[PDB]
Amino acid sequence: HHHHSQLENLYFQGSDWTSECDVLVVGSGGGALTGAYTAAAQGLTTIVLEKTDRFGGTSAYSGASIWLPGTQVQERAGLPDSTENARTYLRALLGDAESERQDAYVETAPAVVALLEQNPNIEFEFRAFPDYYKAEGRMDTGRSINPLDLDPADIGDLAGKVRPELDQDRTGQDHAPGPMIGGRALIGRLLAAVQSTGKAELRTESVLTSLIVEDGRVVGAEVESGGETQRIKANRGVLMAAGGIEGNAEMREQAGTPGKAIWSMGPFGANTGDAISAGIAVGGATALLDQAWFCPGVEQPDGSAAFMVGVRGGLVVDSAGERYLNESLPYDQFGRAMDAHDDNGSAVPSFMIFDSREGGGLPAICIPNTAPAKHLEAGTWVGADTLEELAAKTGLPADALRSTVEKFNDAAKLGVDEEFHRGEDPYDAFFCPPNGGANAALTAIENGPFYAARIVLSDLGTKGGLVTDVNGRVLRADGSAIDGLYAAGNTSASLSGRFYPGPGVPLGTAMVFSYRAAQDMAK
Ligand SMILES: Cc1cc2nc3c(=O)[nH]c(=O)nc-3n(C[C@H](O)[C@H](O)[C@H](O)COP(=O)(O)OP(=O)(O)OC[C@H]3O[C@@H](n4cnc5c(N)ncnc54)[C@H](O)[C@@H]3O)c2cc1C
Numbered sequence: 001h002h003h004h005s006q007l008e009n010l011y012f013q014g015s016d017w018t019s020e021c022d023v024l025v026v027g028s029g030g031g032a033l034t035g036a037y038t039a040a041a042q043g044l045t046t047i048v049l050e051k052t053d054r055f056g057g058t059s060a061y062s063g064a065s066i067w068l069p070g071t072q073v074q075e076r077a078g079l080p081d082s083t084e085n086a087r088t089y090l091r092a093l094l095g096d097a098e099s100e101r102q103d104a105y106v107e108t109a110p111a112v113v114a115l116l117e118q119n120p121n122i123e124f125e126f127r128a129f130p131d132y133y134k135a136e137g138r139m140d141t142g143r144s145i146n147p148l149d150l151d152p153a154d155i156g157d158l159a160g161k162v163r164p165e166l167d168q169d170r171t172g173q174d175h176a177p178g179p180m181i182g183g184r185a186l187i188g189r190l191l192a193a194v195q196s197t198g199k200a201e202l203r204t205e206s207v208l209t210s211l212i213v214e215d216g217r218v219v220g221a222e223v224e225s226g227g228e229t230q231r232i233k234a235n236r237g238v239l240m241a242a243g244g245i246e247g248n249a250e251m252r253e254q255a256g257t258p259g260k261a262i263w264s265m266g267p268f269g270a271n272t273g274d275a276i277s278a279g280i281a282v283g284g285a286t287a288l289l290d291q292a293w294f295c296p297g298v299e300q301p302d303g304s305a306a307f308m309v310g311v312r313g314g315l316v317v318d319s320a321g322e323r324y325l326n327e328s329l330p331y332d333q334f335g336r337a338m339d340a341h342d343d344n345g346s347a348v349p350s351f352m353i354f355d356s357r358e359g360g361g362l363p364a365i366c367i368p369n370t371a372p373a374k375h376l377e378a379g380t381w382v383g384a385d386t387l388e389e390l391a392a393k394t395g396l397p398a399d400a401l402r403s404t405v406e407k408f409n410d411a412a413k414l415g416v417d418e419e420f421h422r423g424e425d426p427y428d429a430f431f432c433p434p435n436g437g438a439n440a441a442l443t444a445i446e447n448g449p450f451y452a453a454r455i456v457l458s459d460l461g462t463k464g465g466l467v468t469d470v471n472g473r474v475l476r477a478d479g480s481a482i483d484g485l486y487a488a489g490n491t492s493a494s495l496s497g498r499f500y501p502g503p504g505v506p507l508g509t510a511m512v513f514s515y516r517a518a519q520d521m522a523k
């Protein structure tokens with residue numbers, strides 16, 4: 001499947017429009033469905049194309065934490081925060097680079113939240129999760145909001161169409177027993193809201209392949225559904241919110257993107273840069289293709305990874321058996337530090353070192369969560385009764401590994417880490433239950449057996465793609481808009497550059513620029 005552009009005139013020699021809509025949405029992530037809702041709610045006929053047999057993509061896997069600050073939702077919680085406070089935080093991290101999109105992000109958040117909560121299927125609440133950088137306007141508790149838990153019965157036939165959590169989806173399973181939470185709830189509610197409008201068609205196994213141009217304007221796109229090709233006309237526009245290049249090893253190697261397709265937490269085979277490709281084919285510029293939403297990943301027997309988040313013990317060594325980062329860093333800064341320290345394989349993989357404090361468990365949240373016994377049969381993890389035997393089994397220098405652990409244990413006994421300042425930040429302390437020691441993030445590694453887990457450079461999607469303006473319009477290298485073409489989420493180059501400012505920025509940006517694209521199409 002290549003994403004070459006089809007000219008209207010050339011197609012007129014043979015075929016014709018299968019269907020017509022005002023707004024064609026490609027993808028069914030948080031952005032896609034927010035854009036679809038915005039379009040359909042104000043009377044525009046809308047078609048949503050999902051490539052796979054399940055709506056939601058990585059947005060479904062998410063915890064549905066959303067960085068939409070200064071809204072009616074944080075007002076109800078009485079949060080000491082504002083549009084201007086969130087605007088300062090972004091300015092302090094990102095600078096003047098993309099300041100117009102920074103302004104539009106923070107200024108439009110309130111309207112996106114107000115439009116969505118109006119729908120009986122949608123309600124959010126503030127949930128504490130710290131912002132990720134020391135800077136003016138940081139919220140030590142967070143300012144991010146989450147959809148309310150959703151009883152799958154309230155949405156009928158849509159619950160079985162929603163992609164399940166990673167602990168189910170990569171083991172051939174559907175939703176696990178309780179309610180829909182995190183991204184399952186975000187996608188269930190957005191699907192039900194889009195459907196409530198009576199102006200939207202929701203399609204599974206409908207793949208975008210090529211955009212249709214007349215006289216340089218996008219007028220529609222051919223979508224493959226069940227062996228047959230269809231030609232869908234879009235009177236107002238095509239919103240492309242179909243994710244990034246995360247699943248395409250060839251586009252990543254070409255762009256110089258660190259990590260690997262097989263380490264991405266995107267749904268296997270889903271996000272293969274189809275929409276970025278179709279956008280370049282009609283003259284769209286690209287930026288930041290070497291950038292991803294990075295995270296450490298626990299290497300799996302099958303060669304894939306698990307998102308390692310909320311670290312609360314252990315330490316991490318490079319291939320010399322030495323600490324080189326604060327292991328408690330927010331996952332994107334952790335991942336960037338693995339890549340920066342990588343000297344042809346000294347940091348990728350890294351080795352997470354831990355003891356039996358958690359009964360053999362690795363001291364973090366791993367998504368998905370493979371059983372220790374499985375990692376040990378497979379050799380992704382190794383165990384031993386001594387650090388000397390552990391260094392032997394991993395090929396780590398034994399004397400260095402022993403010094404590293406003895407020095408980390410002295411730091412745990414003292415309650416400060418001289419070397420990397422672990423535990424001296426509200427993000428670091430957030431995940432840690434009280435221990436009987438001075439710093440909750442620093443626990444002496446001394447209760448046998450001892451484990452070494454392989455850590456790789458995973459991602460939560462790439463963040464490079466098509467250049468967009470404040471209204472989600474796709475731009476050519478010259479700054480001019482391609483008429484009828486919008487992109488959002490990881491189809492579009494993030495305003496965040498080399499930064500992951502706080503929880504919910506991927507979904508928050510996606511939802512705001514999808515809303516703004518719909519509004520621009522309404523005219
Ligand atoms: C465990 C986990 C937790 C996370 N938690 C959060 C969080 O709380 N908040 C947050 O902001 N971010 C979070 N993230 C990151 C976030 O999920 C993603 O970066 C973000 O959702 C990307 O959304 P998207 O719209 O770019 O892509 P997706 O949500 O993946 O949507 C893309 C969709 O487009 C479809 N598609 C692809 N190609 C085509 C095509 N050719 N035609 C039609 N459809 C196509 C795909 O199948 C997919 O369904 C988390 C990630 C993970 C893995």
Ligand SMILES: C[C@]12C=CC(=O)C=C1CC[C@@H]1[C@@H]2CC[C@]2(C)C(=O)CC[C@@H]12
Nearest residue numbers: 062063065129309365502503504505506
């Ligand atoms: C770190 C995270 C991810 C990316 C992002 O952007 C925002 C968040 C905050 C919410 C957590 C989520 C990851 C998954 C978590 C840990 C859960 O399973 C419950 C709360 C979720």
